[PDB]
Symmetry: D2
Subunit: 308 residues, 4 copies
């Protein structure tokens, strides 16, 4: 069976194990720094297997040696933000955690595809590629799928249609400056502008950008995890099953959109080889303006990373 | 449990029972004119239930009384075409069969939504609405979902991407003049023109229109059934689960697109109430030209129907 | 669509929403006494639908009015235990909570099947029946499905066989006195005793009885929720899809096994009518002695309850 | 992705492709000696993927080269029986077909587990092992899973319980002498004898033994395929996902139950290695007498085979 290691057994990591187990994609290793916690969660989820019918071994651990030879590594060890904070506010604590986790797991699973989740996503993904030395296409960040998911949800709600018929591309850093693209948003191939008034659609773009913060202010003591885990799981699936999904993920740019040497949210073809292709869309001036402002927020992020 | 009656237990009908059983949407009644056949197929499929785990009763019958009080009626009793024939060539034999089936089932399930499949689809759907006297929104034809499915498949194959990320609208009668709409075709919200060259995309539109015939010439003694049944099943699901799907189905027009008093392939919101809304897309001159030529092929079809 | 209200949006409650939403069994209402928390979890789970493909409306609230007319009501508002505690230690606090919850929810959904989860399970279920005034067969407690799930998992692990081919019955109160039944445990119809040595099987039985405490000790800050939620979801599913599941649940007894006026873990037929029949197994002397010790324990909690 | 080749794109073969594709277990190659037929069915099934959401490449062919390097090989190229015939009557025709198929497919996929379906099952499986020269545990026949499926269905119908809670073992050749085992039949761990009266259970046993003939008589032009394909698919799944399923299949014996040098229906552990272990049940005298009569029958087909 395929092997999937999830570094960090908190809300996003455990919930990610849940979505993955149900899919019976492969055995799962939940690792954490805290003792007992990952063992408890992994056993609890394993105990649900007779009810649901999936045959996947779910083991909790505190030993990186158990993650050896993984096909995919999911990193959800980062600390989450609390109300009043930005994802960028976590860069110091999470740069340390990220370096620590990657330096230990990466060497034990050289052929694995690493999927980062820790925030600030784009920066942490750059860090992981640096600490691991893995080919850039095998080191990616989860952000786009989640952001576009919130976007697609608000659209289905607004238009009163099935979430299964809504598609939408969204680019840029995983932050306030993310770029949801109405012009690249459709319902069964039909532009969403045909279902939603511009003003209403503007409010949706805005809510999308502030989506994470909306949850934080509701939960009060935590950050979102259901949609995040689903997004992460879908990416793991795309790789394990070589589905050739077209989705927005934080990938390493070498000139696309006039951007070089950065991990940025762009549309890609995700498969068994990780990012198998980065798509270069014909964005217009307004779109590029928004993208550039996002590429700038990200670079700012990388410069902070540099001084840590 | 919900009740679904499938009139006509041949390739499309039995295969439709298969897709539906697996979904555990409701009990299924397979009816046929031939003795034994529907009983055999329904028992054979019922015997698969312990293997797959679905709890749905699947019963074969030759008695319309067993279909009473159905929530949905699927009509797949029509005779299929053989190589060298057009779907229109079946209108005489199938008008008789259709009238016969509808006159017997309709009265026994007054609150049911009827989903026609018999060809020529658009005409047979008009006939069913006439013979049943059911509100027009509760009498619809399956065609668009299937046609667009073939279309979406050729696109995924061409672009080398996941069928799960391809969306595409297709309108008009279910025949040679159907209108696949490249401009309303997307991959994760991105126009398909960004993935396929125009000439290649033209060949896909063509293959789509002749899709059914392609299968017929391969099977030699029969017509397609896997995709057709899947399409039909998805529509049954949309109704039973009130999913508010946005899809192309043969619906009754009263002015939309400048067309009145005809069943025609148009984009609709399909839910518990059947066609809950017909969408009027801003098609351009070239698109309208193709649509009008299709609306003309359909009317021709209705005029033939009139003389039967 | 079917309507399901979950009272108490904590670990088990929210995870139940997750299992349920994935099955697309109906709209879910997550209620809690804490503002924001339910809304956040509901929205977050809702935002995952575009990724998973399920059309379910998940709404969070602090207002019981929103639970009105539910098909099923899940009660997971009880305080969980911490290491060193017995489920019974929660009887006073959870008796108040359970009473508060039932008295407000029951009246608004008189036709709903109430599924209790709050601990101590057996006593709380009895209190619900008493407070709701509902028909006994429509007020049941989840416990046996979870307990048997743990038992079946240990069996699968020990035997090295798919968890899909393992069935196991277990009865009694949801506590230490719990009674798993090796004699009524099979793998593809074959007695487990044929797969697991007596000493080892005895260990599995003991681990099953303390399986909950095991998790509480590993987590240290809370109790299990993945399996508990999967079990609670499977019961909801049994009711809504009228599957006639043969499973152990806390049902009201009137003489079965020689026990009267008590909610106790017993094998039942679960369907749209709730507990449709209480099975009466021919238990030997060994099993009955154990069962009676368990009954004695449950009775004790009731004496405590009736004196609160 | 995993590769699965299905030799013989008829009723069972194509339906297996359908069950398989829906599980998204790997690419499927449908081969047949008749031109066009496999290509048509493959394309039609492929065109359903956009509707169902599965990314599986289904290709039809008349060239064995396309089956090279398959993980699993399903053989469904045998001629089916018509009413009034016994499966054994097909031995001469199907011996030639089976020999032709194996000798061409085996060499191209030396590491594949071969799953036979052609009738008479037991004898054809033996012929495959002989022609392929493969390790006995990697050449198995489907039969018991189907037979037990029918048996389990009848049990569920009679008892009025979910087919999910019914397990039942059954052994012997795939023919009239077939041996279902009431003693090794349970519902959530409880003996079926507790649910079904002896006379009725005896009727279910007889119906199971003739369940195939029953379908052939109802269809009149062919034999069963929905359950047969579901069973064959569950075995393929067991192998590819290494689930360690406990199920009855035609495995090579070397003394178990006192039988040597014969493929016979016996309970095994099915995993990535094919038959990983042959379980040896403690059958009583009644059961053994029946088992021996069955063995006598299978042996007779082998004598016929060895003289072809
Ligand atoms: N990219 C996205 O779209 C997205 C979505 C949600 C959350 N996130 C981010 O993901 C991270 C996880 O969020 P969460 O809510 O699950 O948090 P959490 O606090 O619940 O879980 C993090 C887990 O990491 C563990 N941990 C800490 N240091 C570790 C180390 N060195 N090694 C292994 N494990 C370690 C903790 O003990 C904890 O169990 C946060 O940084 C959050 O902001 C990103
Ligand atoms: N709308 C689409 O997209 C679409 C797709 C595929 C097929 N079709 C059409 O659907 C029909 C069925 O195709 P098929 O391949 O399943 O055919 P088929 O010949 O296999 O099956 C038709 C079944 O109808 C039964 N039947 C005949 N008269 C009947 C009556 N009066 N009452 C009840 N049952 C009766 C037959 O005995 C037969 O079992 C054809 O007309 C075909 O052209 C439409
Ligand atoms: N029966 C079983 O098999 C089983 C399995 C697991 C847990 N449990 C029990 O289930 C309960 C819930 O466990 P948990 O881990 O989810 O706990 P939790 O503390 O995470 O969640 C309980 C939720 O109830 C809410 N709540 C409290 N009073 C309320 C009121 N009056 N109305 C509405 N909501 C209210 C809280 O605010 C909280 O969000 C506990 O009593 C636990 O012991 C039983
Ligand atoms: N073992 C079981 O439990 C079980 C269950 C059902 C059917 N069966 C048996 O399975 C076989 C298939 O049944 P069916 O109903 O699908 O039959 P079918 O006639 O529909 O299909 C058989 C297919 O084999 C093809 N074929 C013939 N010779 C071939 C060759 N040399 N190479 C490649 N393909 C070739 C045919 O052209 C045909 O498409 C029969 O022998 C039947 O008795 C066994
Ligand atoms: O808001 C957060 O911190 C996490 C969710 C997200 O990244 O969107
Ligand atoms: O070609 C046919 O007759 C049927 C399939 C379809 O309607 O596309
Ligand atoms: O032990 C607990 O409190 C919860 C899990 C269970 O009841 O099994
Ligand atoms: O009876 C047949 O020929 C096929 C079905 C089976 O073997 O059970």
């Amino acid at each position: 069976r395929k092997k999937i290691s999830i570094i960090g057994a908190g809300f996003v990591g455990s919930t990610t194990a849940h979505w993955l187990a149900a899919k019976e994609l492969g055995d799962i290793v939940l690792l954490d720094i805290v003792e007992g916690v990952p063992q408890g969660k992994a056993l609890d989820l394993y105990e649900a297997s007779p009810i649901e019918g999936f045959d996947v071994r779910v083991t909790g651990t505190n030993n990186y040696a158990d993650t050896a030879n993984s096909d995919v590594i999911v990193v959800t060890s980062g600390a989450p933000r609390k109300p009043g904070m930005s994802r960028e506010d976590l860069i110091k604590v999470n740069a340390d955690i990220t370096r620590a986790c990657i330096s230990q797991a990466a060497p034990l699973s050289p052929n694995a595809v690493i999927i980062m989740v820790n925030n600030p996503l784009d920066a942490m993904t750059y860090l992981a590629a640096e600490v691991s030395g893995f080919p850039k296409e095998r080191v990616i960040g989860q952000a786009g799928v989640l952001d576009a998911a919130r976007y697609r949800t608000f659209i289905a709600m607004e238009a009163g249609v099935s979430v299964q018929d809504v598609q939408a591309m969204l680019m840029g850093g995983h932050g306030d400056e993310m770029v949801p693209l109405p012009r690249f948003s459709t319902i069964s191939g039909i532009p969403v502008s045909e279902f939603i008034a511009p003003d209403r659609l503007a409010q949706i773009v805005e809510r999308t950008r502030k989506g994470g913060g909306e949850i934080v202010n509701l939960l009060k003591t935590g950050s979102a995890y259901y949609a995040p885990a689903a997004a992460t799981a879908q990416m793991v699936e795309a790789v394990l099953k070589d589905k050739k999904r077209v989705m927005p993920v934080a990938a390493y740019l070498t000139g696309q959109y006039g951007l070089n040497d950065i991990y940025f949210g762009v549309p890609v073809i995700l498969g068994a080889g990780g990012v198998e292709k980065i798509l270069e869309l014909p964005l217009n001036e307004e779109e590029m303006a928004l993208l550039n402002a996002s590429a700038k927020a990200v670079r700012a992020t990388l410069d902070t990373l540099k001084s840590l």
